[PDB]
Write an enzyme that holds these catalytic residues in place. Sequence first.
Site, short mmCIF file in Angstrom:
data_model
loop_
_atom_site.label_atom_id
_atom_site.label_comp_id
_atom_site.label_asym_id
_atom_site.label_seq_id
_atom_site.Cartn_x
_atom_site.Cartn_y
_atom_site.Cartn_z
N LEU A 44 0.86 -1.18 0.00
CA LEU A 44 0.00 0.00 0.00
C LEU A 44 0.91 1.24 0.00
O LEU A 44 0.61 2.22 -0.68
CB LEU A 44 -0.98 0.00 1.19
CG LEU A 44 -2.07 -1.08 1.16
CD1 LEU A 44 -2.88 -1.06 2.45
CD2 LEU A 44 -3.00 -0.93 -0.05
N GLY A 45 2.05 1.15 0.70
CA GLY A 45 3.04 2.22 0.75
C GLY A 45 4.01 2.12 1.91
O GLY A 45 3.94 1.19 2.71
N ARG A 46 4.94 3.07 1.98
CA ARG A 46 5.92 3.11 3.05
C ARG A 46 6.08 4.54 3.49
O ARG A 46 6.18 5.43 2.66
CB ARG A 46 7.27 2.50 2.62
CG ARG A 46 8.25 2.27 3.80
CD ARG A 46 9.53 1.57 3.38
NE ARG A 46 10.27 2.40 2.43
CZ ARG A 46 10.85 1.95 1.32
NH1 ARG A 46 10.83 0.65 1.03
NH2 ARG A 46 11.48 2.79 0.51
N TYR A 49 7.82 5.47 9.44
CA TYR A 49 7.88 4.47 10.51
C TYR A 49 7.50 3.05 10.13
O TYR A 49 7.64 2.15 10.96
CB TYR A 49 6.99 4.93 11.69
CG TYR A 49 7.52 6.17 12.37
CD1 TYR A 49 8.57 6.10 13.28
CD2 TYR A 49 6.96 7.42 12.10
CE1 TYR A 49 9.07 7.25 13.89
CE2 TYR A 49 7.46 8.58 12.72
CZ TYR A 49 8.52 8.48 13.60
OH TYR A 49 9.01 9.61 14.23
N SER A 50 6.96 2.83 8.95
CA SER A 50 6.50 1.49 8.59
C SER A 50 6.31 1.32 7.10
O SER A 50 6.16 2.29 6.37
CB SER A 50 5.17 1.20 9.29
OG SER A 50 4.06 1.90 8.74
N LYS A 67 1.28 -4.09 8.82
CA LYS A 67 2.13 -2.91 9.04
C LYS A 67 3.49 -3.42 9.59
O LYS A 67 3.59 -3.82 10.74
CB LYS A 67 1.43 -1.92 10.00
CG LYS A 67 2.26 -0.69 10.38
CD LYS A 67 1.40 0.27 11.27
CE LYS A 67 2.15 1.46 11.82
NZ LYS A 67 1.26 2.39 12.58
N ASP A 155 -2.04 12.05 16.96
CA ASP A 155 -1.78 12.10 15.53
C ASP A 155 -3.09 11.99 14.73
O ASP A 155 -3.15 11.29 13.73
CB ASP A 155 -0.73 11.02 15.10
CG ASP A 155 -0.03 11.34 13.77
OD1 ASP A 155 0.04 12.54 13.40
OD2 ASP A 155 0.37 10.39 13.06
#
EC number: 2.7.11.1
Length: 328
Positions: A44-46, A49-50, A67, A155
């Site tokens: 899905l993406g980076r 932090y993950s 994750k 957040d």
Amino acid sequence: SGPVPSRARVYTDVNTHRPSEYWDYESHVVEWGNQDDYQLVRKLGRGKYSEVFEAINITNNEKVVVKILKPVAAAKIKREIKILENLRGGPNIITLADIVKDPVSRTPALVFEHVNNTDFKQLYQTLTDYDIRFYMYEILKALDYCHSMGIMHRDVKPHNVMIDHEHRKLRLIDWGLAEFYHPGQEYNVRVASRYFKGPELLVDYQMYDYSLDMWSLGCMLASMIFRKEPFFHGHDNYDQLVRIAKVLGTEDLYDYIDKYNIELDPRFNDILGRHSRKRWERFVHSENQHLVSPEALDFLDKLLRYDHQSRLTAREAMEHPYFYTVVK
Ligand SMILES: Nc1ncnc2c1ncn2[C@@H]1O[C@H](COP(=O)(O)OP(=O)(O)O)[C@@H](O)[C@H]1O
Ligand SMILES: NCc1ccc(-c2ccccc2O)c(Cl)c1
Ligand SMILES: NCc1ccc(-c2ccccc2O)c(Cl)c1
Ligand SMILES: [Mg+2]
Ligand SMILES: [Mg+2]
């Protein structure tokens, strides 16, 4: 001398009347699942932090999200896990399904329930006045829940709120920055994205609480209803404060820092200036009039306050006339 101390006006005592095992994340023993139950389908993406992947749990064939955590302080990893486990089952809280050790990264990988999320850039353009109020109410259920469980998210922003619009399903995700609220504790002010940062973070006031999440919620609401993304568009953390002061005014900013005996950074001298508090109807125009109402403006007024102690709590926000039209 120094800053005047502060306590949350609600849920101040939640963590002291719970066993140490609840909030003492450092002592938590992680019960490891099996990474072989999960098969990565697509990245899905980076982020910072993950790395996040859509995956299939081959034991029940269900869609999941994995994750994979980048290496950070082991304390930051157990904090996320303990908060997710403590909040599991809560209204609109993402469900942590498993924790496995990723064979490639050699780091913990958190497995979550999958939410078929519409990207922010798409929902931002189509949400109706009714839909906005409906989704804000769902968020408040998650925030009142984590706050009543002695946790601040820290957040809150659109990419951390999953919405499956077809099923009107909302989940508050990314508890990676979340913390346990301990009265009198001094927290790190380097939390949240610039545009969502509360005045308490921008003036380096460390004894903040759950009310930081209400500021962020207010920023999300203003950007949505006024069609001004982001609402407070600072070029840096200092200009971020100036952007807020141009709307809320400099006189209430000085009352806030004087109430808590906070000293502004001297670099504010050349950039802050003198600004009146603005009436919220100033931000209304013919392109956002369908998303605005006197109830929305009054609600926004009560969230976007310098004094963290003066903001509506999540439970009070749920009582606001803005949500009277929402089917409950
Ligand atoms: N359960 C989920 N369902 C769907 N998408 C998800 C889910 N969890 C995370 N994502 C997607 O992955 C992104 C990163 O997840 P997040 O927990 O916020 O990680 P980070 O702490 O690195 O920002 C989200 O912004 C979202 O697009
Ligand atoms: N494709 C799986 C994966 C491999 C390495 C890392 C990784 C491990 C250490 C430092 C940075 C990283 O990106 C991560 Cl988070 C995921
Ligand atoms: N990640 C999808 C998403 C989450 C929250 C909102 C949202 C919903 C209500 C009010 C403000 C908002 O920013 C939107 Cl538009 C999209
Ligand atoms: Mg995130
Ligand atoms: Mg995060």
